[PDB]
Design a protein around this nucleic acid. Structure first.
Lengths: 173, 123, 52, 82, 127, 267
RNA sequence: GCCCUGGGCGCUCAAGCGUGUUACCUAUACUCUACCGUCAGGGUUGAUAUGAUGCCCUGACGAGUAGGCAGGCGUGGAGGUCAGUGACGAAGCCUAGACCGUAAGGUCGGGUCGAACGGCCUCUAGUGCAGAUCUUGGUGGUAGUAGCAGCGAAACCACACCAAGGGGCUUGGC
RNA sequence: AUAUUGGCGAGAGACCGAUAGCGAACAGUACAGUGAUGGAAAGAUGAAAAGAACUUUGAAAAGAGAGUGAAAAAGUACGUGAAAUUGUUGAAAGGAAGGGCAUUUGAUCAGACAUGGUGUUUUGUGCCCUCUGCUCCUUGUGGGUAGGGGAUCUCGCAU
């Protein structure tokens, strides 16, 4: 059951847990509202769950119920979130009617964060950044450094300048 | 956030770590009874003890106020979406520059602070 | 060479462990926590015709 | 304003610190001659005109006598003459 | 600047390390022609090489000795450097030993590696 | 066996060196009495240097470069979020470029907007230095009409004489290749085109394989028909890049890391 | 009763002696506050707006040889997991660079390097060095000295002129 | 059916990794002892030698150019090159030095491609209005996807 699953994932090596240096157990599972592998937050430890995920620009409210635990292929249902923020919040609240306040609050927070993540569009609209990040390999760096020095040594710029000046002022004054 | 009061900023050093080259700087408690350091006589190097414990509310927080979190790929980076203010994405030293640009792009898209940006990159 | 290499295990305890392992496979969440990509299995436990 | 908090930062408690008008020292009276101890006009002699609501003192040189215009000044950086 | 300097190196020589170091120090910074003349005079015992680290005469006023064996190799290396500069077409008059170093070689006698560099002095500058 | 291999080759090298020295001494001694034989041997033995082994329009100049009929105004700016090093380099740019106007980057005026404003002000070229760390790494030059531009990488920037107010003389070397002479024309049209020889100031561009060395010197002649020179401060080397041929469109020669394997052709 | 007879520099209505009255400096001593941990108690759900092995409130305590208990850092190898990291550079090394922790150590910034290595739950041990007149290998003073212009060691090596108090810290000087 | 550290021939290791593992990964070899016996040190270049053609200074050591080579910061002393130690440049300081508390000066390193958020006003779009369709389960407070008509339109986006 949930208690057995919860305790096994907690104390028996949950596969998707991440241990931060601060001492917080994270959760990289895609179906979790919060990235922390605590109780009532990990989707595997709770039969009833709700989360917000997106594949295209549209945002979807993902939730699961014990009606589909026996059939993982149809475990999670989704509904278009009505990406109008004011309408979306009320739609989420209505869909999560009678659900735990924790789930409703976490779903609303996740939806708001995903909506405000649209800053990517703002940066995309404000494109034409000319810095053009470029990676330099150690092998490439070695070529320029040594070969540039060899070219400088072989060039003998002073002698060429002297020869050009002598040839120029011979009949240039 | 609460002020980050560092009880002991100076790095602790083993006794005689500089007098002899065969003694590593890593701290090691003196075991001899006659050792002055063990008796913490006045003027000796400070001995680490429970007193220097940092407070929980500011423990592990960098001066910028964001906790460090090692990130290996985009999947790890996406986990900090709900903790951008409290956590910051740190790229591992073994990440090739090829994936570093992609990781930085995703961090900027999600607004996750990067502790060591531009590493191995050139503009 | 005479160091201990094999560990004696009670037969009843061995059967208990096998039964527990078999039972654990019935929980999709437990199987998911094991790292298996069973997110798309039509049913759990997965039953197939003998013609396989 | 309308954006739901994307991260539940804890709200501050009800602070029981009501603002009160500054209780200036009795030595400071309107029309008193003031000596500036710091700033651009440090060491200049100034006349105390009016008290401002921002805890500063409205003062004037006057401007014609010494060039100090109407400016705000703190009571702690001023010596009040008799 | 490689375009204005020449180098000469001698490795695995059998000269005494301390004497070679003293000779190199006594000759560091001197002009090429002046350094060669000083070494030639030393071979004539008219001047002595000071021993300031690895150690009383009037020649030491400028505690001194005449390491002929080390001086021979030093002057040979100087001649090699001069030949290299001539091949590079540098002005021998302006040449001066800007760098000279002695390094302990693998071990018995104490061999050492000696390398020196000569650079042209900057002159003839005006608005 | 390591000992056997080391011992065998150690003796072999000594014998080879002895034979080489003896043969060289004998050849020199016999050539002293037969000077012509030395000449024949030298003719029969070429040093095979890398340089010797290299593997094989007036309208354009006027249209895509400045001319003496109108001095070129060059717009100077810096990439956004620039710091002290960029302004220090811009100081040298002012000291060396004829007519420069420095404008702070506005962070939002697109390249098209900057070009339009420059056209409104009758500017001739745009030069922008870019930085990543507290060091100059690349430089760019663009011409306003028709948008011919070049991008240059910057390396080995080093700060001894004090240049005078005189305009240094321009000299270019090793720009025979068609691509090279384009950069040579760019330099000849971006730097001052009116020499003032009095004052003995010279500015030189010297390409050897792919890097161009820019330096300034004072030159004084002597009766020996030779000219001495002294370093006049900064050291500079540049590497052409991206050869855009437009403002940002239709790149023609943009370099790729996969090149340089041939070891030759010195683009 | 006192005066002569039986720490240095220094002082004599003392800066000496006895007694009397006030001002002040501090120790890890004591009051309060800020933070780490131990203990004891208590709150906690028709589930928590962070793992009931979770989140908290209250009070005191915190020295230490032998010895006992508890919580952790690091390494060789193995089972599992990261559809992990990596020639667009893995390990190692260097680094008058920075971050994290009370620390074992981890992490990142820059240089050489080249092809394997790591985040986490367990199992496993030839698993962590400052010495044992310790083993192998390497290098210094002794010393360009004894010695046989040149060649060239060995013993030894925690460290380097004296007065008083105290075995070579206090007060001073050739 | 039982033993098996010798011999021949095979399948494997939660074993060790050139100071380990058999003393020997390149040895019962060099070497010492009249003798019975003792008994070592030593692995790796580079894809391939492509192993530095050639010029040039040196009786000789090897140097300087030059080039091969991904790299010679891989040159047969060759996969990588830290300490103890040694020489040069620079800074500092001077019958000693070493460490701790607090700070000045000198040198030097980090120090946001942050450039936002809110309400209002034009214009163009779509997942927006309307008409006409297709498609997945189950059946459900759904999802996916098309063809005609416009700026009632801020439902989102870009200006």
């Amino acid at each position: 059951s949930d208690e057995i699953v919860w305790q096994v994932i907690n104390q028996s090596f949950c596969s998707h847990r991440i241990k931060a240096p601060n001492g917080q157990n994270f959760c990289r599972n895609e179906y979790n509202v919060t990235g922390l592998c605590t109780r009532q937050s990990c989707p595997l430890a709770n039969s009833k769950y709700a989360t917000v995920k997106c594949d295209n620009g549209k945002l979807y409210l993902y939730m699961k119920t014990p009606e589909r635990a026996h059939t993982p292929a149809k475990l999670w249902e989704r509904i278009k979130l009505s990406k109008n923020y004011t309408k979306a919040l009320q739609q989420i609240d209505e869909h999560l009617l009678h659900w735990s306040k924790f789930f409703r609050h976490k779903c609303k927070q996740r939806f708001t964060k995903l909506t405000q993540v649209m800053i990517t569009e703002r940066r995309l609209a404000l494109r034409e950044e000319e810095r053009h990040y470029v990676g330099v390999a150690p092998k490439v760096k070695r070529r320029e450094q040594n070969r540039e020095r060899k070219a400088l040594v072989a060039a003998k710029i002073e002698k060429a300048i002297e020869k050009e000046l002598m040839d120029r002022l011979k009949s240039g004054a | 956030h609460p002020k980050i009061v560092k009880k002991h900023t100076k790095k602790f050093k083993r006794h005689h770590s500089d007098r002899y080259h065969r003694v590593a700087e890593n701290w090691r408690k003196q075991k001899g009874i006659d050792s002055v350091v063990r008796r913490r006589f006045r003027g000796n190097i400070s001995q680490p003890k429970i007193g220097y414990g940092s407070n929980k509310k500011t423990k592990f927080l960098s001066p910028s106020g964001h906790k460090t979190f090692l990130v290996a790929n985009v999947k790890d980076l996406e986990t900090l979406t709900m903790h951008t203010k409290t956590y910051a994405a740190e790229i591992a030293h073994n990440i090739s520059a090829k994936n570093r640009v992609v990781i930085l792009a995703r961090a900027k898209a999600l607004g996750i602070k990067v502790t060591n940006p531009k590493g191995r990159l050139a503009l | 060479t005479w160091r201990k290499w094999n560990v004696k295990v009670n037969h009843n305890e061995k059967r208990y462990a096998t039964a527990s392992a078999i039972a654990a496979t019935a929980v999709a969440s437990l199987v998911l926590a094991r790292g298996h990509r069973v997110e798309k299995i039509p049913e759990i436990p997965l039953v197939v015709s003998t013609d396989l | 304003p309308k954006w739901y908090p994307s991260e539940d930062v804890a709200a501050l408690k009800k602070t029981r610190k009501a603002a009160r008008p500054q209780k200036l020292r009795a030595s400071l009276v309107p029309g008193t001659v003031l000596i500036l101890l710091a700033g651009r006009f440090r060491g200049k002699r100034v006349v105390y005109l009016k008290h401002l609501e921002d805890n500063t003192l409205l003062i004037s040189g006057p401007f014609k006598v010494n060039g100090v215009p109407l400016r705000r000044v703190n009571a702690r950086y001023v010596i009040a003459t008799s | 600047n490689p375009a204005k300097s020449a180098s000469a190196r001698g490795s695995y020589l059998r000269v005494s390390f301390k004497n070679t170091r003293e000779t190199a120090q006594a000759i560091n910074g001197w002009e090429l022609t002046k350094a060669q003349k000083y070494l030639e005079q030393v071979l004539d015992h008219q001047r002595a090489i000071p021993f300031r680290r690895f150690n009383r005469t009037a020649q030491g006023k400028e505690k001194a000795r005449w390491p002929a064996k080390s001086v021979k190799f030093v002057q040979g290396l100087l001649q090699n450097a001069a030949a290299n500069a001539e091949a590079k077409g540098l002005d021998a008059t302006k040449l001066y030993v800007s760098h000279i170093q002695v390094n302990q070689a693998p071990k018995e006698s104490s061999p050492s590696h000696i390398e020196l560099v000569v650079t042209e002095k900057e002159e003839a500058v005006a608005k | 066996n390591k000992l056997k291999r080391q011992e065998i080759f150690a003796d072999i090298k000594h014998e080879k060196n002895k034979e080489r020295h003896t043969m060289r001494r004998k050849r020199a001694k016999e050539e002293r009495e037969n000077p012509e034989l030395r000449e024949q041997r030298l003719k029969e033995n070429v040093t095979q240097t890398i340089e010797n082994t290299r593997v094989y329009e007036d309208d354009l100049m006027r249209y895509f470069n400045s001319n003496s009929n109108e001095p070129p105004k060059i717009f100077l700016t810096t990439n956004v979020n620039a710091k002290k090093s960029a302004y220090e380099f811009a100081n040298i740019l002012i000291e060396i470029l004829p007519n420069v106007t420095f404008v702070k980057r506005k962070f939002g005026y697109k390249l098209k907007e900057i070009s339009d404003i420059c056209i409104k002000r009758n500017f001739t070229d745009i030069v922008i230095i870019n930085e990543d760390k507290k060091k100059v790494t690349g430089l760019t030059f663009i011409h306003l009409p028709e948008g011919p531009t070049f991008y240059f990488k910057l390396s080995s920037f080093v700060e001894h004489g004090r240049p005078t107010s005189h305009i240094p003389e321009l000299i270019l070397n090793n720009f025979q290749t068609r691509l090279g002479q384009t950069v040579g024309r760019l330099f000849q049209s971006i730097l001052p085109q009116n020499p003032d020889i009095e004052g003995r100031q010279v500015i030189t561009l010297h390409n050897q394989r792919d890097y161009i060395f820019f330096r300034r010197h004072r030159y004084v002649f002597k009766d020996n028909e030779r000219v001495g020179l002294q370093e006049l401060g900064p050291q500079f080397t540049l590497k052409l890049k991206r050869l855009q041929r437009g403002i940002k469109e239709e790149t023609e020669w943009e370099h790729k890391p996969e090149m340089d394997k041939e070891k030759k052709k010195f683009y």
